[PDB]
Amino acid sequence: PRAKTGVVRRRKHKKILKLAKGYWGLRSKSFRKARETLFAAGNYAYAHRKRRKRDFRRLWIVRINAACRQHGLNYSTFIHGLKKAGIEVDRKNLADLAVREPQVFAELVERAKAAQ
Amino acid sequence: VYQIPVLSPSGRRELAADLPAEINPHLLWEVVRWQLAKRRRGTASTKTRGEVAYSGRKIWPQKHTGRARHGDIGAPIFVGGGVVFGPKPRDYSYTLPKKVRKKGLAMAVADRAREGKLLLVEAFAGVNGKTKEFLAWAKEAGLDGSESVLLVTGNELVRRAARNLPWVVTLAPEGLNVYDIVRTERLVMDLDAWEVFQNRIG
Amino acid sequence: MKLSDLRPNPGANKRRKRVGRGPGSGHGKTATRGHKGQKSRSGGLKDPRRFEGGRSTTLMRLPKRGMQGQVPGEIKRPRYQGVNLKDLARFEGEVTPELLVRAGLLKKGYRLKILGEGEAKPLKVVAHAFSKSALEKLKAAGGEPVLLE
Amino acid sequence: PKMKTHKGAKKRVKITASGKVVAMKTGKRHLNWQKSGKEIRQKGRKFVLAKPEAERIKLLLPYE
RNA sequence: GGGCCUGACUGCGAGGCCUGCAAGCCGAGCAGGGGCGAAAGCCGGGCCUAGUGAACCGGUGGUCCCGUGUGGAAGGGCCAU
RNA sequence: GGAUGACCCCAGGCGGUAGGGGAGCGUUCCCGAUGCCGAUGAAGGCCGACCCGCGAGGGCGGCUGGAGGUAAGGGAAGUGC
RNA sequence: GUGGAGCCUGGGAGUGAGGGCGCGAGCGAUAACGUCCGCGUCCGAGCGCGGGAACAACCGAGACCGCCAGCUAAGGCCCCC
RNA sequence: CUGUUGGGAAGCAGCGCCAGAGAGGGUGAAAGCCCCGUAGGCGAAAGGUGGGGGGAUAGGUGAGGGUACCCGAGUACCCCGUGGUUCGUGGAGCCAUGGGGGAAUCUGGGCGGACCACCGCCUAAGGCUAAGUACUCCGGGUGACCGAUAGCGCACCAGUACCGUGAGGGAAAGGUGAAAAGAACCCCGGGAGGGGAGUGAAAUAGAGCCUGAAACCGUGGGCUUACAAGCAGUCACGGCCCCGAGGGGUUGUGGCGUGCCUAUUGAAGCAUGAGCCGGCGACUCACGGUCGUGGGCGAGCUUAAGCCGUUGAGGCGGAGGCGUAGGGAAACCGAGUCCGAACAGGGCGCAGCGGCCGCAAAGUCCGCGGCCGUGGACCCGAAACCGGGC
RNA sequence: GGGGGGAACCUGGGGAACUGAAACAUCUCAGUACCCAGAGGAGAGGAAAGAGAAAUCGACUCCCUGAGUAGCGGCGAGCGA
Ligand SMILES: NC(=[NH2+])NCCC[C@H](N)C(=O)O
Ligand SMILES: [Mg+2]
Ligand SMILES: [Mg+2]
Ligand SMILES: [Mg+2]
Ligand SMILES: [Mg+2]
Ligand SMILES: [Mg+2]
Ligand SMILES: [Mg+2]
Ligand SMILES: [Mg+2]
Ligand SMILES: [Mg+2]
Ligand SMILES: [Mg+2]
Ligand SMILES: [Mg+2]
Ligand SMILES: [Mg+2]
Ligand SMILES: [Mg+2]
Ligand SMILES: [Mg+2]
Ligand SMILES: [Mg+2]
Ligand SMILES: [Mg+2]
Ligand SMILES: [Mg+2]
Ligand SMILES: [Mg+2]
Ligand SMILES: [Mg+2]
Ligand SMILES: [Mg+2]
Ligand SMILES: [Mg+2]
Ligand SMILES: [Mg+2]
Ligand SMILES: [Mg+2]
Ligand SMILES: [Mg+2]
Ligand SMILES: [Mg+2]
Ligand SMILES: [Mg+2]
Ligand SMILES: [Mg+2]
Ligand SMILES: [Mg+2]
Ligand SMILES: [Mg+2]
Ligand SMILES: [Mg+2]
Ligand SMILES: [Mg+2]
Ligand SMILES: [Mg+2]
Ligand SMILES: [Mg+2]
Ligand SMILES: [Mg+2]
Ligand SMILES: [Mg+2]
Ligand SMILES: [Mg+2]
Ligand SMILES: [Mg+2]
Ligand SMILES: [Mg+2]
Ligand SMILES: [Mg+2]
Ligand SMILES: [Mg+2]
Ligand SMILES: [Mg+2]
Ligand SMILES: [Mg+2]
Ligand SMILES: [Mg+2]
Ligand SMILES: [Mg+2]
Ligand SMILES: [Mg+2]
Ligand SMILES: [Mg+2]
Ligand SMILES: [Mg+2]
Ligand SMILES: [Mg+2]
Ligand SMILES: [Mg+2]
Ligand SMILES: [Mg+2]
Ligand SMILES: [Mg+2]
Ligand SMILES: [Mg+2]
Ligand SMILES: [Mg+2]
Ligand SMILES: [Mg+2]
Ligand SMILES: [Mg+2]
Ligand SMILES: [Mg+2]
Ligand SMILES: [Mg+2]
Ligand SMILES: [Mg+2]
Ligand SMILES: [Mg+2]
Ligand SMILES: [Mg+2]
Ligand SMILES: [Mg+2]
Ligand SMILES: [Mg+2]
Ligand SMILES: [Mg+2]
Ligand SMILES: [Mg+2]
Ligand SMILES: [Mg+2]
Ligand SMILES: [Mg+2]
Ligand SMILES: [Mg+2]
Ligand SMILES: [Mg+2]
Ligand SMILES: [Mg+2]
Ligand SMILES: [Mg+2]
Ligand SMILES: [Mg+2]
Ligand SMILES: [Mg+2]
Ligand SMILES: [Mg+2]
Ligand SMILES: [Mg+2]
Ligand SMILES: [Mg+2]
Ligand SMILES: [Mg+2]
Ligand SMILES: [Mg+2]
Ligand SMILES: [Mg+2]
Ligand SMILES: [Mg+2]
Ligand SMILES: [Mg+2]
Ligand SMILES: [Mg+2]
Ligand SMILES: [Mg+2]
Ligand SMILES: [Mg+2]
Ligand SMILES: [Mg+2]
Ligand SMILES: [Mg+2]
Ligand SMILES: [Mg+2]
Ligand SMILES: [Mg+2]
Ligand SMILES: [Mg+2]
Ligand SMILES: [Mg+2]
Ligand SMILES: [Mg+2]
Ligand SMILES: [Mg+2]
Ligand SMILES: [Mg+2]
Ligand SMILES: [Mg+2]
Ligand SMILES: [Mg+2]
Ligand SMILES: [Mg+2]
Ligand SMILES: [Mg+2]
Ligand SMILES: [Mg+2]
Ligand SMILES: [Mg+2]
Ligand SMILES: [Mg+2]
Numbered sequence A: 001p002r003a004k005t006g007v008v009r010r011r012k013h014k015k016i017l018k019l020a021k022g023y024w025g026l027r028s029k030s031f032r033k034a035r036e037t038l039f040a041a042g043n044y045a046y047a048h049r050k051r052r053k054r055d056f057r058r059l060w061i062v063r064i065n066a067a068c069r070q071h072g073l074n075y076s077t078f079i080h081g082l083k084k085a086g087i088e089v090d091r092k093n094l095a096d097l098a099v100r101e102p103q104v105f106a107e108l109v110e111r112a113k114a115a116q
Numbered sequence B: 001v002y003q004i005p006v007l008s009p010s011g012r013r014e015l016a017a018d019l020p021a022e023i024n025p026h027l028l029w030e031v032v033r034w035q036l037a038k039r040r041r042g043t044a045s046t047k048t049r050g051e052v053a054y055s056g057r058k059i060w061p062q063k064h065t066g067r068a069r070h071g072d073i074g075a076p077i078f079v080g081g082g083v084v085f086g087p088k089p090r091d092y093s094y095t096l097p098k099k100v101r102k103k104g105l106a107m108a109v110a111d112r113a114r115e116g117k118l119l120l121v122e123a124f125a126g127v128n129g130k131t132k133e134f135l136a137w138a139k140e141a142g143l144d145g146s147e148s149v150l151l152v153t154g155n156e157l158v159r160r161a162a163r164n165l166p167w168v169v170t171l172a173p174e175g176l177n178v179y180d181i182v183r184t185e186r187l188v189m190d191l192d193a194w195e196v197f198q199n200r201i202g
Numbered sequence C: 001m002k003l004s005d006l007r008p009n010p011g012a013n014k015r016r017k018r019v020g021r022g023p024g025s026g027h028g029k030t031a032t033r034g035h036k037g038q039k040s041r042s043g044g045l046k047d048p049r050r051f052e053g054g055r056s057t058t059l060m061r062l063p064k065r066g067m068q069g070q071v072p073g074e075i076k077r078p079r080y081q082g083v084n085l086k087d088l089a090r091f092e093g094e095v096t097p098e099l100l101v102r103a104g105l106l107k108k109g110y111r112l113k114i115l116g117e118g119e120a121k122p123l124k125v126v127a128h129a130f131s132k133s134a135l136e137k138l139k140a141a142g143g144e145p146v147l148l149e
Numbered sequence D: 001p002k003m004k005t006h007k008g009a010k011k012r013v014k015i016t017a018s019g020k021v022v023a024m025k026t027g028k029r030h031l032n033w034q035k036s037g038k039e040i041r042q043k044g045r046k047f048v049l050a051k052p053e054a055e056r057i058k059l060l061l062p063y064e
Numbered sequence E: 001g002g003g004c005c006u007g008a009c010u011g012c013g014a015g016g017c018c019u020g021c022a023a024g025c026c027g028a029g030c031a032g033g034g035g036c037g038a039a040a041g042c043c044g045g046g047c048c049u050a051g052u053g054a055a056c057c058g059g060u061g062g063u064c065c066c067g068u069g070u071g072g073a074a075g076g077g078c079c080a081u
Numbered sequence F: 001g002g003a004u005g006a007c008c009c010c011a012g013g014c015g016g017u018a019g020g021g022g023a024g025c026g027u028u029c030c031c032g033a034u035g036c037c038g039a040u041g042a043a044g045g046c047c048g049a050c051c052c053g054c055g056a057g058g059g060c061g062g063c064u065g066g067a068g069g070u071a072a073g074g075g076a077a078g079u080g081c
Numbered sequence G: 001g002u003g004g005a006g007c008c009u010g011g012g013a014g015u016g017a018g019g020g021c022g023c024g025a026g027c028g029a030u031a032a033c034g035u036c037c038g039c040g041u042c043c044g045a046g047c048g049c050g051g052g053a054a055c056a057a058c059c060g061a062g063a064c065c066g067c068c069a070g071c072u073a074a075g076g077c078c079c080c081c
Numbered sequence H: 001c002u003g004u005u006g007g008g009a010a011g012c013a014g015c016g017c018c019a020g021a022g023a024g025g026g027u028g029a030a031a032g033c034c035c036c037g038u039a040g041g042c043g044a045a046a047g048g049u050g051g052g053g054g055g056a057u058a059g060g061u062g063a064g065g066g067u068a069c070c071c072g073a074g075u076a077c078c079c080c081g082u083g084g085u086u087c088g089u090g091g092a093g094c095c096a097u098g099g100g101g102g103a104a105u106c107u108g109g110g111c112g113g114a115c116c117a118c119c120g121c122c123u124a125a126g127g128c129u130a131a132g133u134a135c136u137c138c139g140g141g142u143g144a145c146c147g148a149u150a151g152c153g154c155a156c157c158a159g160u161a162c163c164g165u166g167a168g169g170g171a172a173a174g175g176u177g178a179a180a181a182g183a184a185c186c187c188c189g190g191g192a193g194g195g196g197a198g199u200g201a202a203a204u205a206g207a208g209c210c211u212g213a214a215a216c217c218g219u220g221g222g223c224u225u226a227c228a229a230g231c232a233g234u235c236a237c238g239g240c241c242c243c244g245a246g247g248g249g250u251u252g253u254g255g256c257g258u259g260c261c262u263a264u265u266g267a268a269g270c271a272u273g274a275g276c277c278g279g280c281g282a283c284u285c286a287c288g289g290u291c292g293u294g295g296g297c298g299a300g301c302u303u304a305a306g307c308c309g310u311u312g313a314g315g316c317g318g319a320g321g322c323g324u325a326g327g328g329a330a331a332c333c334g335a336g337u338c339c340g341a342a343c344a345g346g347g348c349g350c351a352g353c354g355g356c357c358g359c360a361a362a363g364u365c366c367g368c369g370g371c372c373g374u375g376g377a378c379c380c381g382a383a384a385c386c387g388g389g390c
Numbered sequence I: 001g002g003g004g005g006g007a008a009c010c011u012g013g014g015g016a017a018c019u020g021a022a023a024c025a026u027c028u029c030a031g032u033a034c035c036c037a038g039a040g041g042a043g044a045g046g047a048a049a050g051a052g053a054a055a056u057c058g059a060c061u062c063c064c065u066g067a068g069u070a071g072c073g074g075c076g077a078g079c080g081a
């Protein structure tokens, strides 16, 4: 018996073109350019999932640094002090305290100054 | 080994049969594959790039046209050209070993015997060729058409009367075959067919 | 047992290897042929059993030996097939060429020669020849060697 | 169609009971005046072909 | 340097070196019949590593294995070159 | 572990071209099928932010369409761009 | 020394254009992103990740998946960062 | 047959009936019983056939003994040159014959692979001869055959249109609906086209007609954009719009970021290929081999062509094949054998698990799978070579 | 009585090359493709101046097998009773 293409390729192409919705020009209209764009997009998302963890740690550290310098020490002294005081609140929560609970963050600065 | 109900004007007697104890499903599958393959027509066919109607002329020069190079238009790259590795007329039959067929036959009957779905009969009372007659005989025989039946008898008149029934498959004893046995929920043979069956599996 | 229960045993019907059907299969593109060269081509190599890339082949450098024959061919002569005493153990009474041919021991068109592997039986054994030891063993066992011509 | 026996092999080689391939040693067809008795004598024996070459030759003899 | 000599053996060959193959290389020991030596022993060419060429086809000497109905023969095989 | 992939627990491996092996998805056709799904709407088309699946895919829902389609389990290939 | 170790038999391959770097030589001119070998390495196939401004093979390190958690490597900590 | 939903019943429901017929195709949808059929039967005045039956006719028919008349001529035969055969000059016979020479009539002649002898086989140089075999323009039956880029080149007015001086080359192009009920009439328009009306179950089924994807073009709407550096995405946050601790759309800013494929030591590469979309497009099949694997049987395993049956039924058939012994160039011997003087040494060979019973196995058969040989053998592509024509 | 036609099949008279031999000439492809003459529903062949070892068989044709055997072969590729 013969098995022609039939419906199979159109359905395969429509799955790809649906994923490429929103892309520019033929990148969302042509099956070939959509798939090439999707190849890059998939690698980017994987790479940026990793990169997002670093991006947010940088931001925390910058905010933590500025809150520290209002109390007369720098970030790197503040982190060492927390290490010697045994405090393990992470940078996501330290940065939130720096903005939302300045009293609590100040007492943390106190503990860090005292630990050295 | 097996106790087989017989249907008689003198009541449901019992006959003993030396049917195999072990039903081997893979082997039964091998017989059916053979039965279904050897009946194939093998008439699918296509045309090669040599058998298609076009000329062997090179459609345009090798070089300097700006097109891809080509020879004749029967090449399978062309719409309307030959088929690459299409079906050709083919013989699907093969010689399954005789002992596998014979032993397959016995296992298919033995499987029906072990379910209680095998029934032997001495005669078919008033079955003289008419469907309504075989129906009346079947009713008393316990064959109400709720189960498909493979009817194996040499009585030509009995086969003619039963054969139009959607739930009956009819065979002469020399035609007993495992595909037809396994196709049907019940097995009914007269004592004569039961005997040519025994001669075959011996 | 019905048709929807008929199944081959595991491994009785394996799927084929389909090449040139896509990256995920592991056999896409070059279709397990590697890259270029004569072997990748449709039509492929010269017979690997013989050809050696142009050098004189392993086989052709070895010497011929023996009678190869001449036209008009094989000289017709009587041929013998050995049958051991052990193979005769199944028989009783009188074993002969025609009988051993039936049981699948002797091949048609061959004269019978009894050889001496195994134990002789008290049998009348008709044959075209006997090894020295087959004679010894058959006499000593009470059997009777009858020698045809 | 059915394979053809290679007759160059059939004239040079034999398959033994266990499937080894045995051939006559090379090198004493001629130029023998200055070869020692040891060379002539040992070149008159059969030898067992190395496994890779023996497998190829056996494929050439499908009906032995 | 001299004496006697032909082992510059025949039939084999445990075991190895080398090595893709095919080749190449070393070889104790047993038998036959020898050489030299009182003997122990040595001798299967040459202090050693180059001095060489697989097959196919054909010549020659031997062998007396095959011999196309049979006996021969033709022509082959085998051993040596 | 329990007893034979029932599932759980602990540990370890899991970059990859040529290439070797394994397990699956889907397409056409046959048995299953004188069956079963179907005008209270087949196939195909167009949607979906929902469900299942690692994935290839499979469901389900709405719209279109207007007459076909075809299960568990197996079989065969003009089988996936 | 229990390792995606080793050995045996067999089925299937692909490869037989390498390249950079370190070290050891030859060739070259104590030239070449030169060339030809040896030992090793990486790229090839890790054009995946951090550093080196950018950059296959230099330094760091062998990416199963997820996390808006933590510790480090080379390299960094005036601003871009 | 009735009811019922429906444009329509064959669907569903009630109650029946036929069947040597429940193959299949129609009918407004899905029908054994409405139609065409199917099973089972029946049928030729005329022409054709008639291999079967019957009848003619042609033709066919003894034994000794003697006689030695006849028994296929430029033939046999030999030589030369070639062909045929498995035979390529080979030890080269046989069969055929272009050249030369050239018989005999059975006590004649040819053959059994040079030749000779022996022993046999056959009767050359005249002719005919059914059947079993091949093929498929034609008709029919049937498909794990195609379904409009497929299947014949052609489903259709095709060997046409068109191309070529000619030989020759050689397309595309199927589908309204159940029924034409194929849209009277009015309105804008020169017409085309449309808007109403009307038909229809349906009219984006309206003839440029089933379904009606994609590229491509346009109208409307949401978000967004004129200080901005870009393989066009991705991660984050915010704004707006939409659907109702959530999600979809959009993208302002910030971070990161060198297309795909091919070929390469190495490509984003300024190296190859691709305008975009849709459809067609490349590892197969037969036979043999080798190994693996699922079964059958096991010192055995297995049939081939056929024959009989069946009409999607299987069986019969042992001729033959592989295996059961090897070694040797062979004669030959044989669990051995070959080299050899060897009784030497060496090469190549030789030897199940349980309690008579299971089980397992040599081997072999069939299925499946990898790979090999033979074929075009994964697909496309030369320049060329040859034949017959134009 | 002939003439001319007929898809394929058949017989006879002539008869390539690419290709294969990983070059090529013998060899192969192949007495194939093709040209020509003729036959007919078939055609050819056919009633032993046979076979070839069986003290044997008994026209011819065709299928299976014998058998990729016997042999043939730049004893190569291959060919093949
Ligand atoms: N006795 C029988 N074979 N019955 C078979 C039923 C019908 C079958 N199709 C035939 O043609 O006969
Ligand atoms: Mg396709
Ligand atoms: Mg299609
Ligand atoms: Mg498609
Ligand atoms: Mg696709
Ligand atoms: Mg679709
Ligand atoms: Mg799809
Ligand atoms: Mg967008
Ligand atoms: Mg665009
Ligand atoms: Mg645009
Ligand atoms: Mg578009
Ligand atoms: Mg993706
Ligand atoms: Mg990630
Ligand atoms: Mg990353
Ligand atoms: Mg990290
Ligand atoms: Mg400070
Ligand atoms: Mg720290
Ligand atoms: Mg910490
Ligand atoms: Mg078929
Ligand atoms: Mg075709
Ligand atoms: Mg065809
Ligand atoms: Mg063609
Ligand atoms: Mg052609
Ligand atoms: Mg053609
Ligand atoms: Mg034509
Ligand atoms: Mg043509
Ligand atoms: Mg042509
Ligand atoms: Mg041409
Ligand atoms: Mg042409
Ligand atoms: Mg060009
Ligand atoms: Mg141009
Ligand atoms: Mg162009
Ligand atoms: Mg082109
Ligand atoms: Mg072009
Ligand atoms: Mg061209
Ligand atoms: Mg072409
Ligand atoms: Mg062509
Ligand atoms: Mg063509
Ligand atoms: Mg075309
Ligand atoms: Mg076609
Ligand atoms: Mg066409
Ligand atoms: Mg066509
Ligand atoms: Mg094709
Ligand atoms: Mg092809
Ligand atoms: Mg082709
Ligand atoms: Mg056929
Ligand atoms: Mg097959
Ligand atoms: Mg067959
Ligand atoms: Mg049998
Ligand atoms: Mg029936
Ligand atoms: Mg039926
Ligand atoms: Mg039934
Ligand atoms: Mg039936
Ligand atoms: Mg398969
Ligand atoms: Mg296959
Ligand atoms: Mg697989
Ligand atoms: Mg597949
Ligand atoms: Mg794939
Ligand atoms: Mg694989
Ligand atoms: Mg791979
Ligand atoms: Mg590719
Ligand atoms: Mg491979
Ligand atoms: Mg492969
Ligand atoms: Mg390969
Ligand atoms: Mg390459
Ligand atoms: Mg390569
Ligand atoms: Mg390539
Ligand atoms: Mg290469
Ligand atoms: Mg190449
Ligand atoms: Mg290669
Ligand atoms: Mg090709
Ligand atoms: Mg080639
Ligand atoms: Mg050379
Ligand atoms: Mg021979
Ligand atoms: Mg002959
Ligand atoms: Mg006795
Ligand atoms: Mg040879
Ligand atoms: Mg030699
Ligand atoms: Mg010699
Ligand atoms: Mg010689
Ligand atoms: Mg010397
Ligand atoms: Mg010597
Ligand atoms: Mg010498
Ligand atoms: Mg010697
Ligand atoms: Mg054989
Ligand atoms: Mg001296
Ligand atoms: Mg001296
Ligand atoms: Mg002396
Ligand atoms: Mg040794
Ligand atoms: Mg060696
Ligand atoms: Mg040397
Ligand atoms: Mg001595
Ligand atoms: Mg001595
Ligand atoms: Mg001595
Ligand atoms: Mg002395
Ligand atoms: Mg001495
Ligand atoms: Mg010595
Ligand atoms: Mg010297
Ligand atoms: Mg000296």
Ligand SMILES: [Mg+2]
Residues within 6 Å of the ligand: none
């Ligand atoms: Mg020297």
Ligand SMILES: [Mg+2]
Residues within 6 Å of the ligand: none
């Ligand atoms: Mg030498």
Ligand SMILES: [Mg+2]
Residues within 6 Å of the ligand: D029, D030, E054, E055
């Ligand atoms: Mg030589």
Ligand SMILES: [Mg+2]
Residues within 6 Å of the ligand: E056, I074, I076
């Ligand atoms: Mg040669």
Ligand SMILES: [Mg+2]
Residues within 6 Å of the ligand: none
């Ligand atoms: Mg010779």
Ligand SMILES: [Mg+2]
Residues within 6 Å of the ligand: none
């Ligand atoms: Mg001689």
Ligand SMILES: [Mg+2]
Residues within 6 Å of the ligand: none
């Ligand atoms: Mg003799």
Ligand SMILES: [Mg+2]
Residues within 6 Å of the ligand: none
């Ligand atoms: Mg003779």
Ligand SMILES: [Mg+2]
Residues within 6 Å of the ligand: E071
């Ligand atoms: Mg004599």
Ligand SMILES: [Mg+2]
Residues within 6 Å of the ligand: none
């Ligand atoms: Mg003699």
Ligand SMILES: [Mg+2]
Residues within 6 Å of the ligand: none
């Ligand atoms: Mg003489």
Ligand SMILES: [Mg+2]
Residues within 6 Å of the ligand: none
């Ligand atoms: Mg002689």
Ligand SMILES: [Mg+2]
Residues within 6 Å of the ligand: D028, D032, E080
């Ligand atoms: Mg010699």
Ligand SMILES: [Mg+2]
Residues within 6 Å of the ligand: none
């Ligand atoms: Mg775990």
Ligand SMILES: [Mg+2]
Residues within 6 Å of the ligand: none
């Ligand atoms: Mg991996």
Ligand SMILES: [Mg+2]
Residues within 6 Å of the ligand: F021, F022
């Ligand atoms: Mg695996």
